Every structure is written in structure tokens, then in C-alpha cells.
Design a binder for these strands. Sequence first.
RNA 1: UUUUUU
Lengths: 49, 99, 305, 305, 529, 50
Amino acid sequence: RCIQRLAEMCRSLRGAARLVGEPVLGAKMETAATLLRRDIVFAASLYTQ
Amino acid sequence: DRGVYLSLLASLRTRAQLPVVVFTFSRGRCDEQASGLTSLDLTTSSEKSEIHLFLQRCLARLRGSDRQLPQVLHMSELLNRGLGVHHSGILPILKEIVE
Amino acid sequence: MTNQYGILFKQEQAHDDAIWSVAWGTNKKENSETVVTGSLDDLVKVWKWRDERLDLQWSLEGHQLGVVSVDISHTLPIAASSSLDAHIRLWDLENGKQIKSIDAGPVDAWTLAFSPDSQYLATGTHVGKVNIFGVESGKKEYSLDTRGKFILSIAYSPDGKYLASGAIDGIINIFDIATGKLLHTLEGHAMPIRSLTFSPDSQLLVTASDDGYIKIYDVQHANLAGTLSGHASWVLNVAFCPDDTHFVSSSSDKSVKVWDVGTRTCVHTFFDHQDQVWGVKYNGNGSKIVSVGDDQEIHIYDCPI
Amino acid sequence: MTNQYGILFKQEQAHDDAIWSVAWGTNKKENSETVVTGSLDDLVKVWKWRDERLDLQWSLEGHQLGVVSVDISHTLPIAASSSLDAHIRLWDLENGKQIKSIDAGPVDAWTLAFSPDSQYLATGTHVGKVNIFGVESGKKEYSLDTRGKFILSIAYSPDGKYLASGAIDGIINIFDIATGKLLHTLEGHAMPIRSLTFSPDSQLLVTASDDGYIKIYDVQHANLAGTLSGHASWVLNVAFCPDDTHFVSSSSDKSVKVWDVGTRTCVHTFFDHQDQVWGVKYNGNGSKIVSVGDDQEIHIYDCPI
Amino acid sequence: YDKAIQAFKSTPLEVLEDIIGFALALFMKGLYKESSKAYERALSIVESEQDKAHILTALAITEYKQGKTDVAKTLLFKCSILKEPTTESLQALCALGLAMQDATLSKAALNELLKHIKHKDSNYQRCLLTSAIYALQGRSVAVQKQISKAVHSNPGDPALWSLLSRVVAQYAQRNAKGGVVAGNVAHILDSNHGKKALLYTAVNQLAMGSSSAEDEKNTALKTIQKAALLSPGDPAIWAGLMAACHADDKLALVNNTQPKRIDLYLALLSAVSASIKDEKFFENYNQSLEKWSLSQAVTGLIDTGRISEAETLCTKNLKSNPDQPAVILLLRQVQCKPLLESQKPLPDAVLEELQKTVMSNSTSVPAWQWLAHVYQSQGMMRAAEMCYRKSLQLASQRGSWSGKLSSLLRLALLALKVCMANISNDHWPSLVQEATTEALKLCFCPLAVLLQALLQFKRKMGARETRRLLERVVYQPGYPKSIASTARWYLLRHLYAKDDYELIDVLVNNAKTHGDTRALELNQRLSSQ
Amino acid sequence: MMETERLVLPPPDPLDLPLRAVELGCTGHWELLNLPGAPESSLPHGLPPC
RNA sequence: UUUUUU
């Protein structure tokens, strides 16, 4: 639950660093997000599919 | 508490009031008595087959290492007999199968 | 903010060795959904995605060495395959039996591509030309010529009138099928290309070279609209979605990415394969992706519209 | 009368080319003192320390490229040798008869070390795994692995439940043999290791570096309790003695220095071995020292207790 | 280059950059004297002595091209006399030394390079120069040892592993298995070294033979195909493919299941030639590759059975150029295949012609072995022996090793076959003895020991020594199936000669614990005579 | 070249086996085929120059 | 010692 609640905040910071004008935080938060969601932590819910 | 639950389930199986939802108030006790109950086997053979087919079809999407680790195996063992636990400290993929 | 992507089915061991190419065809007017795959064998197995799973239908085979390219047709039930065997034998897909066999060596064919109307079956040669054979009508009416090197990738625009060809060493050539005259030659990348694709309505040509970049050119001029760099090794295929908004790329770093051309960014990455991924395709109304890999497996994903 | 460390022997041409691994086994309490060496000529030779000298017992073979590591077992008379083609042999050491030949794939094994009761024969791997092959009965009993680079040197704790593994990047991983759960990772250096040695009553761990420094660590923590700065060029091998008092080191600058933990100074330095030294070892007590260099000479020094 | 020269013309050539560029363009086109003049002119106006050393090295290279190695050498020494060498003058000096077949200065240059230069970070070029120096002296085993040393120092570096595999394929191809492992390691440790590493591991697998567990997915054919998919540009992959197809056919024939992959030789030859045409220059290597590919294609076509295509291919090649004594032998071979396939006697005129043609191209053990086979076919045994002897003498002088063993074993087979016929002039056993002793002197050839067993059984059939030798051949493991079966079969017949039913059933269980059809069936046939 | 002819009995005994020697690879590895015919080495011209 | 969301 903590990892799921972090990969969803390191993605609204990708949206705010693009708004402030920080293109190096955008390129680091867009990496820290894609390396954080790979496996059973992000398994699709049975109900949804 | 182990004898209390086995005497309750003995008086509960004699009648048809079987699908009983225990409400515990802390997760360690919650998985503790589900581990400690350890012999009911309330399920027939065809229910064994359907439980096994459904759980294998839903669990066989994900990869190798992720499908043999302690909770998955332990919960599958309990579910085989027809028992589940549903506290807040288990993977959502197991809450959804139990539900 | 992205959508819900995910696996639906996983064939465990389709062939006995690496799988080198895949084609998905919604050929029949009804819901057939036939998938044809070729491997480092003689086998050209013909699968069918019926409702929720793939059931093997044909295991047809006549080849001697590994198959390097397979193709399917949208009008007729038919398929074509080429190999290191110097033969282009084209199958039937209905009774599972060979129809023809064309003799052509690594100097006459490397990779296959049918016409939009399933009539011509162009292939790329070694000496630089593109050879256009004739299905059901014999062999080798004419060959387009580009004064270049070994040619790896061949693409046909969906509406006709355009044929594109990548090569070892990078250069890209665009011909028009109407007259057979070279429109213009792009200089592109600096390493082999080995995959190309137009977009539906044919105004956007997407390459994928050996250095990791994905150029997005624009047809009818020489404009390029950007360079997509998000892989970590070679890029081996690019398939463009039925609606002109996304495309899928499989690389030799064991990863299938889904891009969108509006903002030139990667929406979702699939980390499910365990070895090089040699083939990706969409299906009909593009909402599922097939991916054949170096480890013998067939993945089918779910990309909701 | 001071008994100073003396050269006391030289054997001019032990092998035909460079010598790479030396092991000293006092298995028999009687006059056996077996010394075994592997030397890039694909020969593993067994020598014995008879009265004051080395007399060859036998030279035994079967190895494709040069031999990289040899080991002698304390409990039973038995030897083990690995080479560059990742192929492991066990030698009888009573007849020279190759008891067992543990094979291995392209990337399985680099160096070797027995278990204290001579049962497991742990070995490193080009891609980071530390898989263990049960002696004389089993193959690939299990594979204890981390994520990391090439792993040059591997040590086994004397008492047990410890296994320290250096890496080419320069980091140390120590694993408890009970279950395989990494105890703690030491950053180490920024250059490869090439040697790891424990102590009897194993509380101190000594690491050799490729920059010439030697680092002393305490097993209970990551306390970098030491640093020694005498060797000019790389350091290739470090060994202790049956008492926790001092150790020998073998640089790549053609010098063997004997350091002490108590005072952290070089009590003595040896000047032999025209070319660089690749191995050093101590016998069943502190008396005698064996050094094998790149030049084809075996040296046996003396160092009173 | 002409456009470049014209462009450099339309400027005042007064700064170092313009003069240097002009010089390189001039050198590229030809015109070495002009480039030398321009480089000297650039040398006049020079600061930053690194550039002075580089200009001196360029001068040495450009005049070397014309010839005049003496002046190039002195100019490179002059460059060395500067305050600090550049690691580029040293490498050029080593290569210049290697271009003249003398290792005196090359060793000195290499030691100089090693001595005080560590900031170079290639680590592959130094190994290549060191190995080339050792190969110059003809050592040919030291080379592999030197590369093994280099790989021991830096176990990373895919390039080093790949080079070790290549060297094992070229020099000392008796560590074929180790080479296969080295190529596999190089391919694993990266992806972009795939191309060369797969080529070299495939060639090593070809050299090895079939020394595996008859496992699929890792045979020579599979690896060469993987390499062909990775890089379809070099001609070596196509030649390797031709060799792999032929070897697979022979292995299937040994296993006796089915020949497969029959007719593609002409297409592969076309691919090889087309691919060579676009390679810049390794002239000797390209010529060698094309010659080997042509010969292999003709032989493959003859074996499969398409004689006519082989004939037309050879004739076209001769129609291209005046005769070269290699291809004419191929034409002779294709000519003389129908005849002697059906029994026929050949006339001394044709036979003498063939012998004369073989002397044309000497220094080739294959040719001599083929001629000896022809003599044996008609039956002129002693002449066959002489031709085989010439092949052995030639092979031993060349330092090759496979040819020596092949010739010796072939001669032993000739003598044993002559003995089989119950011929008088009891001298063929003596020839068998000498050939087999030499064969065992080289190695541990199972065929040689079975051949001795057959000689012993045939000559002085006897009771004990023959059975002992045969049983030793058939009972210790590590022997091929076919050889074990033949020794077993003769031992069964002889063991039946000296009746012991117990021992015969022991032989039966030995057959049972393996797979056989013929020994036990013959035993069934001869249990009730 | 001394005899110029040899006459031999080709089916000397029908029980025994003719010896067919097939050569596999450059490192010595031979095998025995059953049916009679030519020697049939593998890679007759040697290894391809790589 | 229970429970939770942008």
C-alpha cells in the first residue's frame, strides 16, 4: 500500500515540475516512477478485468 | 481459543448454519486462529476441482517467483479446505480471490 | 493518468526454439482472429485466438531451416513465409496445405510483405533492389532499384501508392507504387534499420534502427517530427495502431513499449518477457497486442481503446 | 641468535609457463605436506615437502585453457581444480585418478573453495551467482545469488555460516549459509578484489584491492578498522596463519610483504620472483611460506612462529 | 575525393587545419608524394608537440605506402626522440616492424609501449600486437597462451573473450571445446558482440565434431543460423552455413535416420560472392574465402547427386579465366564420378592423366588422399600406399595434425582390407603394425586399437590374446557405439568358437544394457546352427 | 606403382562386415558406417576461413 | 491496538 501510494505521488510531481519549469526533476520523477511499478505490487485487480 | 473455535464449529456443522464470519479485532489473532484451526476439510471433491481450476486460472497470469512465496502458498492451503482470512495485511490479489 | 494495460494469456512453450516473426490477421469477415508464427524450425504454426485463449489449429511445415519472415492477407485466406532455405512457399490457411513454392535465395528475398489488395508480395534483396513477385500469377514481373546495400525492411502504405525500404547502413528510400519512381531518400540513422511501418491514412512513417532511436518522419515531404529514445538496446519492430495515435515497439532489452505520436512519449512499458522480443503486432480494431520472443512464449496483452 | 626469514629454496622451472594457484595441505600428520599448483599449461602438479625440498609426485591433466584455481581439503586427501573453460575436476591425490568431473556451463564457476567438513565446494560466477556443487555426490545443489558484477574471489568462514564474495566493481557480499539471507553488503573499493581471507575464530575479514590498499573489516559490522599502504602496484593474494597474529601479501610489483594486525606494519619484505607473484600460502602452522610467481619458480620461505 | 580536393583548393592554405586536411584528402586519392609534401609543409608551422609527433607518424605512414621502409623507420625513431612518446608512434612502429618479417624492432617497440604507457584504455590492441609478434616467429601455441594470459588479467571485456575464441579456431584447434565456451561467454557478457562471437563459436563447434549428448538447440547449425539473423553481411557466415549443412548430413548418415537440407549450395555460393564484393580490402582473405566456397559447393553438389550442375559450374569458372590447377582438379573429380560408381576398369591413359594433374597442385594432403582412394578402387594397392605416404610426408612437414592422423589411419585401413582378401606376400600386417603404432604415438585413437584387434583376430586367429584385446576394446567405457558394436560382434563369434555359454549371455546382457538389434539377432541365428 | 592390378573376392564371407570409416571434425573423432562405399569424411576441404 | 483517501 505504501509503494502504491508513492508511485502515484511521484507522478503528480512529474506534473508539477513541468509547471514550475524544472526539466531535470521532471526527467528524474519520470524515471523513479517507471522503475517503481513492475510486479505483484501492481497486479491488476480481478474485478477490473 | 483453539478449543473454543473447534467446539463452536462442531455445533455449527451439525446444523446448516455454516458460512460463519468471525470478526476479530487484531490481525495477528486473525491469522493466528485461522492457522491454528488446522482440521475441518468442509469441501467435497467437485468443489475441490472447481476451486483448483479457478484459482489456477487466475493465478497463472503472473510470473514464476511471484507465484511461490509464503502467503500465496499458505492461503492456497487454507482455501483448499474451504477457509479464508480477510484482514488488512494481505496482498489485494488474495483478498479478491477470497471474496 | 494512463489507461489500464495488462496481460490476458501466456502460451508457455509454443515452439522448440526462438520465435522470429509473428503476424495477426482478422482475415475473414466474421470473427476468426488467426495468428501465424514462424521460428528457428521448419514450423509455421497457425494459431486461433477464439474467445479468451489461443488454440493451436495447424502445424503446417515444409521448410528446411529457420523462418525469418511470415505474412498474412486481409482479403483471402493465405499466408507466405521465407527462410534461410532459399524458398518463399505460400500456404492455404484453410486446409493447412502448401499452394506454391518460389525459389529465391538471400540474393532474392529476405523479408515478406503483401499488397493492400493481396496481389503482389514484395521482398527485399541483397544487391539493393526490391523484387515484386506475383501471387497466383507466376513470378517476378518487376523490381524497383535503389543504388544501395542489403535491404532489410519493406513496408506498404495502407492506401497503396507508397513503398518504403530500410537498409543496412541506415538509408531509407520511398517509392510510389503507381509509377515506380523514387520520390526521395532519407539519410536516417547510422546503423541497420530492420523495421519500418506507415500509419493508417499513410502520412507518418516510423522507423526503428539498431542504435536505440525511433525516428518519426512525415511523408510527402522530408520533415521529421522527432526522435523517440527510451530503449536501452536495439529496436527490433514497430507496429502502428489502427487509430493514428499510438504504436508499439519491442526491443532487445526485453521490453515492449507503447508510444503515442501526439506528444512523442512512452505511456506504458511491459516487462514480462525474459529474452529478446522479436515481434509485436496489433489486431483488427487495435485493442490487443501479440508479442513473440526469443524464449519460446506467446504473450497477448490488453490495450483498451 | 636471531632466526631471520630465509629464502631456503628455489625451484627453477616448475612449469613451462606462468603459475597461478598454490595450495598447501597438511592432511597427513606424517611427512606428507602435499603442495599442489596449477599453472596455465593445463597441468596440476602434486609435490611433497619431503625433508628440506620439493620432489614432484605427479603431474595430472585434462584441462582446456589455463588453470585458474586449485584447492586442497583439510579433512580428507582430495583436491579440486577449476580452469578458464569452467570445468571442475576432483583429484584422488593418492593415485591421480580424477574421482569426479563436475561439468559447468559457459558461466558457472571461476574460483573454488571447500567447505570446512569438505562437502560443498562453493564457487563464483561471471554473472554474480555463487552456486554451490555438493562434493562427489551432487551437482548444483543450490545457487545463492545477489545482483552484481563478475565475482573474482570467494572466501569460506572456518567456523561456518559466513560466505564473503568480492566483485569486479569492488563490493563485498556476505551470506549466512543457514538460509541464504545476505547478512550485510560492504561497499568495499572502486576496483576489483582478487582475494578474500578470514581468520581462525573468524571475527576479522581482510580484503585485497587492485589499487594496492588492504582493508581490514570486523565481521559484526562494516567497521573499516584498517588500511595498509606499502604495496606499490596491485595486490593479488592475501593469506593468514593458523594463529590470529599476522598475514602475508603478494603484490604485482614482484614483492611479498608480511604484515601484522597488532601493529599494522611490515615486519619483513622479500626480494625474489623477478616477475610478479600470484600466490602465497601458509602450512599447518606459522613456520613455512610458499609463493608461486609469474616466472616459473616455486619459493619456500621460512618464518619462525 | 576529387570534390574534397577541389574544395580545399579554394582557400589560402596557410593554417595548420587546411594543410592537414589537404594532405589527408590527397593521400586518400593516391598521390602519396603530394601528401608527403603537404605534411612536411604542415610540419614547418607547428606548436603543441603532440601534433608534431602525429605529423611525423603520418609522414612515416604515407611514405611507407610507396615503399621506402628504411626512411619511414628512421622518421618514426625521430618521432620517438621527442620529449614524450604518444602511444601512436609506438603502435605504428610495431605494425611497421610486423610488415617486415623481423621481430627485432617490434619487440623493442612493444616493450617501450608497455613500459611507460598506462593512460591508453583500449586493452585489446596491445594484446593483438603482442599475439601478432608471437605468431610472426611461427610459435603458434604461445599465441593462444598469450591471449589466455590477457583474459586472466581482465575477466570482463567481451572483446578479449571473443579474440580468444577466434585464435583457438585459427591457431591450435585442439582446444575446440574451450573455444566454444569462450565464444559463448563473450556472447553472453553483452549483446552487440553477438555477431563475431556466434561465428567463432560455430566454427569451433564444427571443429569439435559431434562430441555432445546429441542435444538439440545448441548444435552448429542452430548457432550459425542465429548469427546469420544477427548480421547478414559478411561472407564468413554464409560459408559457415554451407559447412554446417554438409556436416549435418554426414552426422545424420552416421546415425542413419535421414539426409535433410539437401539443395541450397548454389544460392549460398551466390550469397558469398555478392557479400565479398562489398568488402573494402582484406584481399588475401577474400580470395581464400571465395576459393574455399567454390570448392565446397562443387563437392556438396557431387555428394547430393546433382552431377550436371557441378560440371556446368566448373566449366563456367574455367571459361572465365585461364586454367588454375585447383579448379581443374574439381573438374576431373566431377568427370570421374559416374565411372567407378558402376564397376569399370579404367585405362592407364586417363589414370596417368589424373596423376599428372594431381602433381600440378601439390602441397595439399586432400588431393593425394583422393588419388589414393582412386587407386584403391581400381586396386593397385602398393601405389595407393605410396600416395598416402606422400600425403603423410607433406602433412608432417606442414606441421598440421589432423592430416597426419587421417593419412596414417587410412593407410592402416588399406592394409587391413588387403589382408581381409586372404592375400599371400605376408607383409600387409607389418604395414598395419607400423601405421597403428604411429597413430597411438600421436593420440588415443579408438579406431586404431580396434584395427589392431581385427588384425590379431584375422592373422593367427588364436584363443587368448585376441579375445583379451577384443574384450578390452569392448568393455571399458568411453568408446563410440559403432566401434564398440563391431568389436563386440567379432568377439561374440570368436567367443562362440571357444564355447562358453555363460560368457555369451554376459555379452548378451552387455548388448541389452545398450541398444542393439544385430548382435543378439545373429546370436539367435547361430544358437541353433 | 608396381602391381597395376589386383584381383580380390568382394563377398569373401557374407557373415562378416566391411569397414567404412567416417571422419568427423578436425580433432580426431572417427566412426564406423555399415553399408559399403566411399570414405565420406566431413568437411573434406577443411575449416572455412573465418 | 482497529480503520482510511486525492
